Nucleic acid binder design. Sequence first.
DNA 1: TCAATATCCACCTGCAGATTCTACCAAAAGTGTATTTGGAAACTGCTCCATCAAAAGGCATGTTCAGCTGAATTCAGCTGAACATGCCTTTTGATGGAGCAGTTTCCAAATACACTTTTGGTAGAATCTGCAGGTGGATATTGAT
DNA 2: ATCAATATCCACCTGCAGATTCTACCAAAAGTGTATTTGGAAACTGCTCCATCAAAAGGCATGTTCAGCTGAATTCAGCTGAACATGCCTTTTGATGGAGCAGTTTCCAAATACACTTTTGGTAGAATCTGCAGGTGGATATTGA
Lengths: 108, 104, 93, 95, 78, 84, 98, 99
Amino acid sequence: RAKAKTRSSRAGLQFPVGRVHRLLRKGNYSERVGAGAPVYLAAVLEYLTAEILELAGNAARDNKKTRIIPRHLQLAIRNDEELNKLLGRVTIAQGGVLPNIQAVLLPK
Amino acid sequence: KTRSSRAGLQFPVGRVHRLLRKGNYSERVGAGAPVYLAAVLEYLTAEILELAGNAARDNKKTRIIPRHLQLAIRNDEELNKLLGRVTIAQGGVLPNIQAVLLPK
Amino acid sequence: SRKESYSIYVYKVLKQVHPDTGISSKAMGIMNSFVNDIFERIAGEASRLAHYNKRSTITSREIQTAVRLLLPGELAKHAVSEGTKAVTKYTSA
Amino acid sequence: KRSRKESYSIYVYKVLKQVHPDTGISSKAMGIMNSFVNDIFERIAGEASRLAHYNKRSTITSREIQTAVRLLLPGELAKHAVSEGTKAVTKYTSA
Amino acid sequence: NIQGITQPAIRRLARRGGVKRISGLIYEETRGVLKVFLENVIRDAVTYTEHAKRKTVTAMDVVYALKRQGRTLYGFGG
Amino acid sequence: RKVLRDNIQGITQPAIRRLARRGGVKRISGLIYEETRGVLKVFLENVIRDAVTYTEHAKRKTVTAMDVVYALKRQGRTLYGFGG
Amino acid sequence: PHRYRPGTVALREIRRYQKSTELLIRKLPFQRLVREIAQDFKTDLRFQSSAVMALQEACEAYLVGLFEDTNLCAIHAKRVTIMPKDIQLARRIRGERA
Amino acid sequence: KPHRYRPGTVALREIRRYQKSTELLIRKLPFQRLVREIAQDFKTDLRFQSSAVMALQEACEAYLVGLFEDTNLCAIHAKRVTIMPKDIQLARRIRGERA
DNA sequence: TCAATATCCACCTGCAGATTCTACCAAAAGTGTATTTGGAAACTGCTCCATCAAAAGGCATGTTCAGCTGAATTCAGCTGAACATGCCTTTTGATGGAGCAGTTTCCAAATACACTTTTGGTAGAATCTGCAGGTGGATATTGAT
DNA sequence: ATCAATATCCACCTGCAGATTCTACCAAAAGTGTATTTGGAAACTGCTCCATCAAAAGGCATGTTCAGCTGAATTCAGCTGAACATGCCTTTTGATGGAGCAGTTTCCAAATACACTTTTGGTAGAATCTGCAGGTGGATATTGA
Ligand SMILES: [Cl-]
Ligand SMILES: [Cl-]
Ligand SMILES: [Cl-]
Ligand SMILES: [Cl-]
Ligand SMILES: [Mn+2]
Ligand SMILES: [Mn+2]
Ligand SMILES: [Mn+2]
Ligand SMILES: [Mn+2]
Ligand SMILES: [Mn+2]
Ligand SMILES: [Mn+2]
Ligand SMILES: [Mn+2]
Ligand SMILES: [Mn+2]
Ligand SMILES: [Mn+2]
Ligand SMILES: [Mn+2]
Ligand SMILES: [Mn+2]
Ligand SMILES: [Mn+2]
Ligand SMILES: [Mn+2]
């Protein structure tokens, strides 16, 4: 028999393709799931976690830290128009809010 | 011997049960599910019609139009809630004016 | 093709509550939309409940909880009532 | 007598290393990532399921996932998402 | 074609919304909002049309799009 | 245990004022504190009512972190950080 | 030689239009706007005569709703005339543009 | 003197302070009782995972911080700087929480 | 109030555009048998939730005292409602006809199953290090004179 | 236009509580080997969707007027922020007793697999009627004197 290659590696993905397939089945979204769907979806999820990760990392670098924390994810998310809209109705535990004071409240 | 007749309902208990199995909701459906649900559907329907009718009368008409439904909806706290994000087409809005705007 | 709906059923019911009353064509569509929406919400909630408790079957119990999660106060109680009532009688014979 | 529970941690961490070779992530943060991944998974798959139903299809192809992404994700994130998905899939089918 | 939405129309709307006095700048501001609303709802609808592989946009497409946007509309297919 | 009563007054002004500062509020009308409490209580009862409903459908005597996360989602206040 | 004071015909309009449920925008112009918009997404399309109604009902309902909220915002600012900013605060708090 | 900052100096100092951090602003125990109380009125003899309560608080506090933001905005619209019940009321009606 | 506009609400009344109520049929739905299988009782290991104890300090409460903020008033340019008047674009109506969206009718490529191997995760100990919590000199900011 | 009276900064500093590294079972993925069908093509069909196109007012720009409204500007009572002195009660830290969570067996009762028998519900129709539209007047509601 031939060597076992994880479907992920055949896609050059870091995310578990088989996991995504299994879940597409247990979830009852459809009677049957294609072969690429888990691959496509897994790629996307991997692509999205990659995107926020890059921003948070920079956000960690800015604050002079090396270990990401929830606040970095917040800043990352709330400063990017898009991730902000995608997660507009999401509350990130221990994230805080963006430093922001209404102009009119400042001294004159 | 219609599965609905047993439950003493008008709404199709069978059709509903079909709609469930085929709707990708769960691997399997129970005998009661279609029953219980269809009855919850019939119930709510009656409620809308009951109040919509009364509006049909109050408007002097005899046939319930969309307006009578909207009036029946937006006037009931609970229906208005359950349907707080729905747009009854050709329904208009409830006659209301901010007293701050009334003359004198 | 066959385009099914709830037009018949909405009407039978309409005939009970208001025998002397009729219903528009559009107004009937609205009614259809309503039944379909509530069915979806109820079904969906019910669906998720099962998944959470790692149950693979949607009984009348998930339907009832879904109803209790979705409808407002008095609306829910009467809904549940009518719901168990229907189930009870169904089980009679 | 154990109850091993799954998570995406192993993978987040690999992606964390490609974008930031030497940066770490606390467990509270990793928790927030798992949430995120499941939220989007749920959302995508959900919309996908609906897309198949509206069209009388009984199966979810990578085509359903794609329209889903186009409906759920905002503009530029969608472009990039879609591109990488198509890439992963055409690469996959080349055995 | 957006200017097709005459001020008088915008006034009838505001009138149904219960507005007594209208500023002149509103009219354009309202044509901007209307525009975004249609764009969004159609961009989603057409997407459904094209997934269905069609050249005709149906009530259901609009309907499903409205639901997407959180603007559920009864009376046109669901 | 011991009768739990008037616990809403546990949410003090100092705290209501600290939450407003994060909200970026500079000045606060003295009548705000009773409003907040009222709003907070209505918010909490709803999240908690849905949760315990989930807890009862799963036939447990314990409200789990997930019971809450699901309650929050039903209400459109999706929370990240405690599972799910 | 006869004149209703400013603001009175208006209350008459408010009362009138809130009583009715007819569409308030000229059909053709709308359908024209719709079709134009759609073009920027996919050319040579076609719309069920209904699909354009579902669209009008949607819009007007959205706008009329948005005006109520707007009107409230003006009231809140002690005014009685809706200003573009009243529309922005409304949409800002709705989460439409936050 | 004694030294003395003018009305609003410390207020802005506080805003800057509480926006730079992420710690829950409400006291833990009080919040817990309130929870156990409200919950007792729906179902008696319930128990809570320490974290269910931590979630609840994360959620309540985020909720109110967003509420104050909108509130505060309705105060600046009425050409004011002091938020009032009047403001919280408008914010919630427009959000749809209590039309 | 009085009294002239303009409105607006009723009071009947007849035709037809849409309800309806039928006549008849494919297509669910329902009936009968066999399978398959889902978890509900019945135990149990044991994780973590409820209580507590005790101590020290971080904070909530009250209190003064007065700087400003909210609000009440006063005061007009001028912006936006009420009418008229001039017609331009939107309606109303089939009418023609073919772009399309359905609709069967094959089946090759794609999925689903059923075991059988293989091995990528996950639940714990090991072993480390970001960085939390202090410390305290700069430097900025703030409010007094 | 200078002064200290504070608050905010940050570069170091160093345990220690969370990572992060290192290892053994397995509950999935990963192979093959058959079985099952989904859902594109083709071949046409009946439905709408799109244009014409010819009037015909209804509804929309312009204008003319000026009646309130929406900004300013002032002014002041008194409310809310800033500080402190008190001393309460929230934190912190385990220490322990079990309630009830969950992991594991064993099933009847319960839902799923086909394979025929039966109305039921939906279309396209002949039967019926509820309002829309108009026309009049007669109170209403405005608004000027
Ligand atoms: Cl696929
Ligand atoms: Cl059942
Ligand atoms: Cl403005
Ligand atoms: Cl107030
Ligand atoms: Mn109580
Ligand atoms: Mn058998
Ligand atoms: Mn079993
Ligand atoms: Mn002021
Ligand atoms: Mn053709
Ligand atoms: Mn291995
Ligand atoms: Mn491994
Ligand atoms: Mn530090
Ligand atoms: Mn003047
Ligand atoms: Mn003074
Ligand atoms: Mn026990
Ligand atoms: Mn029949
Ligand atoms: Mn009439």
